[PDB]
């Protein structure tokens, strides 16, 4: 599998990888920070049973 | 201005060359398969709008 570094310059791929991971990490954190369940800056000290839960089926 | 040249044989080696720049055909305004389909699909869109 090491032959793929002949196919792509690692000096390019390392920058692209770090950029991809940095974006993905920021996206996931801000998606969670925008949620109610995981808005940890305001509600992080709530216990798991105290944490919000999205609405369930009314079984109507 | 107002001393225009006019070129009878083909410029690009008024008029225009029929030829190739490698894979690229020169002369007609290029459509290819994607251009032809684009005009067909787009024409039907324009017709539906105008008829409505």
């Amino acid at each position: 599998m090491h032959r793929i570094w002949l196919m792509y310059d690692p000096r390019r791929v390392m920058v692209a990888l770090v950029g991809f991971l940095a974006v993905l990490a920021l996206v996931i954190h801000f998606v969670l920070l925008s949620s109610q369940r995981y808005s940890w800056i305001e509600n992080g000290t709530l216990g798991a049973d105290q944490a919000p839960v999205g609405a369930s089926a009314p079984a109507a | 201005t107002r001393v225009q040249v006019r070129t009878v044989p083909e410029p690009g080696i008024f008029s225009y060359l029929a030829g190739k720049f490698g894979d690229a055909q020169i002369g007609p305004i290029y459509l290819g398969w994607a251009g032809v389909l684009s005009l067909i699909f787009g024409f039907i869109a324009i017709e539906i709008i105008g008829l409505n």
Binding site: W5, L6, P10 | -
Partner: protein
Amino acid sequence: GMTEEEARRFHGYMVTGTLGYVVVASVAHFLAWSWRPWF
């Protein structure tokens, strides 16, 4: 470019570093799960 000898050397670091990153992310998920499970 680079030789197959350099490519093998780079690949060995790259695999080890990738696996290191996934291991640390595994611990972060273990800690997040025990704080507030998502299922």
